[PDB]
Symmetry: D3
Subunit: 253 residues, 6 copies
Amino acid sequence: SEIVKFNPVMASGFGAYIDHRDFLEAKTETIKNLLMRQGFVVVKNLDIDSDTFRDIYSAYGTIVEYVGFGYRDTLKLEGEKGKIVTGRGQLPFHADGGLLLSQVDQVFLYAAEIKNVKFRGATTVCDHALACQEMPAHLLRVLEEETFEVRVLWFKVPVFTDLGWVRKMLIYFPFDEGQPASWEPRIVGFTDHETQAFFQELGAFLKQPRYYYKHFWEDGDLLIMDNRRVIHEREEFNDDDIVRRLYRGQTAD
Amino acid sequence: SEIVKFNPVMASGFGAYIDHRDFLEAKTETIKNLLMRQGFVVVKNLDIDSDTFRDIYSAYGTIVEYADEKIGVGFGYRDTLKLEGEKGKIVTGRGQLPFHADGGLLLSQVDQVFLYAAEIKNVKFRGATTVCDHALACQEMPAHLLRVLEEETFEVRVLERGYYVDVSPDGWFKVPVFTDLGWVRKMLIYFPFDEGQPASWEPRIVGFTDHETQAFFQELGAFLKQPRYYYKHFWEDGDLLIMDNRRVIHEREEFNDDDIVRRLYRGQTAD
Amino acid sequence: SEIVKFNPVMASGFGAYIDHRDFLEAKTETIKNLLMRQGFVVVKNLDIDSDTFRDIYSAYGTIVEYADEKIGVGFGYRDTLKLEGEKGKIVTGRGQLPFHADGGLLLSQVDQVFLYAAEIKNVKFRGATTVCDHALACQEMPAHLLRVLEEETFEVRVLERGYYVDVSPDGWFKVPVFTDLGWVRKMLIYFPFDEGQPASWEPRIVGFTDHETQAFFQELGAFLKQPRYYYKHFWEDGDLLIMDNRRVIHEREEFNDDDIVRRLYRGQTAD
Amino acid sequence: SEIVKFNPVMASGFGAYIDHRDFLEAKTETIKNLLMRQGFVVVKNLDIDSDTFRDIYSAYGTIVEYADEKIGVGFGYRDTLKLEGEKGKIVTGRGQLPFHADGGLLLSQVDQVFLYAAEIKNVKFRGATTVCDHALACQEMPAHLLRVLEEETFEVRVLERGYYVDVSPDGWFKVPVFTDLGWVRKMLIYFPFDEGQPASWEPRIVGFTDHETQAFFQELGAFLKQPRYYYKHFWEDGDLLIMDNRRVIHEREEFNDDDIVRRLYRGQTAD
Amino acid sequence: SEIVKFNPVMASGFGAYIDHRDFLEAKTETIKNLLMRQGFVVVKNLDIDSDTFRDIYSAYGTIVEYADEKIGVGFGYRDTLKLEGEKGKIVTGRGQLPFHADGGLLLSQVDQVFLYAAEIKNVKFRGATTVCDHALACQEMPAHLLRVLEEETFEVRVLERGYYVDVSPDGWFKVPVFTDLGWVRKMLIYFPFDEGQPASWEPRIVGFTDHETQAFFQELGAFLKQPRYYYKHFWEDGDLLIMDNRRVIHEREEFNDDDIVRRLYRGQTAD
Amino acid sequence: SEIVKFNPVMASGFGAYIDHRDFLEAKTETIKNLLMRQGFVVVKNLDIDSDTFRDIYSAYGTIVEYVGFGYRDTLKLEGEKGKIVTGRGQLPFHADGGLLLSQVDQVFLYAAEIKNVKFRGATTVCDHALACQEMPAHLLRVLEEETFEVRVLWFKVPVFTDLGWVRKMLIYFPFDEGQPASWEPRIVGFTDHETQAFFQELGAFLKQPRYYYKHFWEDGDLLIMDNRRVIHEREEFNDDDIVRRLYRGQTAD
Ligand SMILES: O=C(O)[C@@H]1CC[C@H]2CC(=O)N21
Ligand SMILES: O=C(O)[C@@H]1CC[C@H]2CC(=O)N21
Ligand SMILES: O=C(O)[C@@H]1CC[C@H]2CC(=O)N21
Ligand SMILES: O=C(O)[C@@H]1CC[C@H]2CC(=O)N21
Ligand SMILES: O=C(O)CCC(=O)C(=O)O
Ligand SMILES: O=C(O)CCC(=O)C(=O)O
Ligand SMILES: O=C(O)CCC(=O)C(=O)O
Ligand SMILES: O=C(O)CCC(=O)C(=O)O
Ligand SMILES: O=C(O)CCC(=O)C(=O)O
Ligand SMILES: O=C(O)CCC(=O)C(=O)O
Ligand SMILES: [Fe+2]
Ligand SMILES: [Fe+2]
Ligand SMILES: [Fe+2]
Ligand SMILES: [Fe+2]
Ligand SMILES: [Fe+2]
Ligand SMILES: [Fe+2]
């Protein structure tokens, strides 16, 4: 049972900054373990190609393809115009994957190339377990008792999947007006007014600095998330001068 | 001197969730006492009618009622006010009621306020009754806000003439912000209605311009609405919410959707 | 309803330091009110004699006094007790008085207690009067301690017969730990004297062995003595310490050095 | 996933009080899940015999039991251990069991530990079972204490030969303090017994002197016993305490009074 | 070393309220010292003319003044600047002055800044001078905001040419955000003016777009304005506000109401 | 104005752990600055001889000799039997140096050789500024208003010297019974009983983990303190098997 050197990201003690050399030398298991309780790992100054990226993430478990024969492993998020996920707009709060064979345990994001962007296109991370514990009861009640449905632009998405150590969160926040949308949420028995108001209020609570981390990208950055322990978002970068190229990997057990 | 089981509502330890059986079996004095320090009580799944509701609340003191020459108040409800979201009404209407304490505008002492949900339909995230821990808020408030509350003169004018008849004063009258009862400084304050919400009353601050008064209420409002001090009650059939009117202030949030059914019964007591 | 300037004593906001001019100019009601929520008041550099001391405290309510058939209590002090560190005495002696509330053992209601330092000499770090914020302590206390206080039967027996005469009961008698006044649960508790300190009274807990009772009081004691709840007043000439007897409990620490001069005047009021 | 209603035990939010009816109606998986994050569950007012106790705990996984070859372990209890304060025994005796995790000394994995109060008499403030939130404590621990736990080699020797027979290793053997399970670093540690308490086991730290090890454990113990991390359970008939043995460590405090009746049932499960 | 009596302004312990008599009797060095750790001092009820104001502030070090060659700076004030809300001016105008430190744009070192209220009329909730505890804020700041402050190049351009004449550099020039003095990282930063407010200066960040810079300042401003770091001073006649310009940054909020009289004296000193 | 990478030692944010390479590469001024607000610096794995130790510390200002001609620079604290300061017993809470020309601004301690000790002979550091701010008023009153005198085994030692950014503390706690003592404190107008009780109570408050750091020594450890910002203590190591050899340097401006 080995230890890796890290520093917490949040004041709560959540998250982990790891030096690139310490990360590279650590056993896969050591990082996989730390991620479960720290939620996310931030590594800077990591000069690697796409093949090394795959060598790194594939060791964490079975690759989740984005039938499959193992080829759709690394997703290139390069801000392609006319796309949503691989596009240039917002991705509101969500977790990756779904249930059963489509579940995702770990998500890896690596910055291949970043140019002309300093305060847009952040990837954000929310400590949902701590947030749900400290949340006003009227917000937590909705998450725990009401049926959340989603339509791809209706099916039930169970908000909480109790794994004991965490309640894995699956949720899909609405896109901001003006943003190209791939999904639309609703809450059974709530009006449009009520659902809009709920997501606005919940979104504001989840974005408080105690729970919320904003990662602004630099070449060689690696962001790893335990997809069961955090939820995440991409902020818009809709300027054509911006170059933002990330590689995405996903693993599960 | 007896004890009732309860769970705190607020992270601070303020408020009281009480199981309906525990509430019903408790002596009136036990609940009346707890309210002084806990500010408010929340009971769910209480199955009672209006007569039993009165039996419960009347035991807490002298019923605050408007009869004889005062029969005009609240359109002649006498004791138990029916808040049923009626069109063309404000207090008993479908819009917001901003932060207030009961009784003040009618120059009546109100110690306890009781709200029971007779019927709630097609509303999940509107029409909340909200509760503020003002003692703790005043203790932790930025000095420039507390100063205004402690030192400046607040005046109110009523606007819903059908509700207040001639029991309320005619024009602008002074409402003392704090009344020192020792164990608490009872707060009597009357916030401005949001733009677009029909206004039952209207506040001003002497020596302040309209620009300053608006800015002050909005800033104070945002402070008081922080989760540390602020509880939002979303109504279900059989909910009972009791407030110590000296220890908390409260609001109703708008429910201006025609499909909503929201009928509450309201009782008031004082000593 | 009027305001007195003060600074909190405790980091929690509890307690009140009041400048002597501000205290003297304030109405009795202003101070009486503040005590209910602040628990205690500290005034320094007050230059008064015993007659003026009585003029001040008697305004707070009905003087708790022992005359006629009760003239035996406290060796015939009647109203203002002189605590002057007399040999062969306990309450008015030179040793510890463990955590207690006033009045309880004599079956008298005491709301406010006043202590004025007439003369203090050759003491800088002994002979403190200490004050505990019991409401906050009970709120934050470990459950296994609070349970005992709320559920078990506490009994006391007096030992200083010359002080309590026949006004106190003869043997062991029940003292209710909490009396619910709503705004506070008034605490009546009587801690055991430390080994080596002459004992004016003695507690027991029904159903507990001597081993368990000793362990409980020591553990509770250490909890109550934490800085968050606990204020230590080291006396200087002209100090006035006022306590709301329903809102705090207090102790005196030993001053068993013959060179020490420690003379306090004590008044008590109730409604 | 189903939700069981509970209230936190610790101010931090750790631990779970669950109503006996809510507990009985809950799916095993619901409680088993909750235990991983809450560390321990406290249920009062259960009325169950030894067979029903077994039916409840056995559903949580594979029963940790010692039969056939390992029949000597625990003086032949097999599955449910009866801790009844037997004279001349230690684990099932009347003395202290210092901070520990179950199973480790027998080289058995134990995930959940169950303790039910069959009979308790003449004890109110002794014989407690205590629980430590070790994950929070390690996170907030002074660095000089955590360093020892993370970097030094901890060895243990089994002393109560009748309890551990030949299943436990002979002489000193290394027990790893932390085992990283990702969601938690499982703690395996075996504190030294107080002087005067019969010792079932004995710890040492390689490279440390006897006084360094004694000093370390004394200081670490005091830190872990702070109320932020520490819960004391005083037993009553029908109490059920469940612990996730990976998430908390626990102790028994002595009850060496002849009049005390203290009989607990113990079950253990693992996956 | 002498001690001046004071009360903290912020809940954190930062800032100092000092009684006017205590202030006047205090040695200059005592106040000068206290300011380094308390950031700012607030004195009320001073009755002083402009000459006495100068005598007080000039004792704190070398007067930061602009005479002879630099006589054009501040429209020829020399030592004491009169901020009297003059139309067609900005610094001495009636609008907002956003978060800043004094001196930096003129390339002058300023250690202490003094502000005295000569005359204030018809203003109760506008025209505040505000103070930010930047050391605490930077320590608790979200990492994405602090990174910009520590790593990016901040440039400023002077716009109110009449105020800064030829002493300020022409066009865009780099201003270092942090200057490490050991005891503090002195902050030099110049926030953008709100739209509708006449701008005395203008910031940019090298490599940032206009909307990135605007977005950064909006978010940073909101964080710094949290009551934990932020004090709002609403002026009355005889108020004195002193700031250590190395330890805090400050702003003026608009007072663009014609009826408002707001005349402040300003002094600056450095070593 | 340059920055050095560090991690806080205390949960309050006080103190600084610095990696040995980062420390060696940092400018003297950068460390000297950080020490003023962080109180103390901890560096591990520093393999240097006595001459390099001197090269390092002498750059911080004027060397304070332990008349002088500059030769008594590095004090060797090697646990010599029959000595106090360079002995094997306790040194209770104190700051180094005195006033005027004998003042000490920075104290450096380096572990040349450490053997047979794991839980004795710690050097401890107290955040006195934070402690004085949060202290019960009855404790702070004594420190602020009463005269403290010391006798070498009577002269006034001013408790607080107000430097603005800090109140520099000079104080000399009594030695524990059984420990060889080089000084003895008293408080004017307090009895022996009262003074003993005060130091006991104050000592307990100052040793709470919020304010108090314990450094257990390893070969190559360097502990630097800003002597104006912290007070410190040595815990006994009175076992003859223990090897504890520290080099001490002191600088002032
Ligand atoms: O108590 C009342 O009946 C009325 C309704 C609005 C509330 C506030 C006040 O004075 N009253
Ligand atoms: O109030 C009293 O006179 C007495 C003295 C001790 C105190 C506690 C109590 O019942 N009394
Ligand atoms: O799990 C067990 O049966 C035994 C009893 C003592 C406890 C600690 C340990 O290894 N065991
Ligand atoms: O210090 C000054 O006189 C000028 C006025 C505005 C303030 C900010 C700055 O560089 N100055
Ligand atoms: O582009 C990013 O920052 C993350 C994209 C993402 O969340 C996803 O691919 O699911
Ligand atoms: O309808 C409600 O929520 C409460 C209305 C109210 O506050 C009142 O009756 O004064
Ligand atoms: O002497 C004192 O400090 C107070 C004595 C006391 O508590 C009492 O009079 O009951
Ligand atoms: O008796 C108890 O309180 C629990 C004993 C125990 O921990 C064990 O049997 O291992
Ligand atoms: O008018 C004020 O409030 C202060 C103005 C100011 O900061 C300045 O003159 O630089
Ligand atoms: O030996 C140590 O740990 C420090 C000694 C010390 O404090 C000193 O020399 O002044
Ligand atoms: Fe995603
Ligand atoms: Fe109301
Ligand atoms: Fe008393
Ligand atoms: Fe056990
Ligand atoms: Fe300025
Ligand atoms: Fe030293």
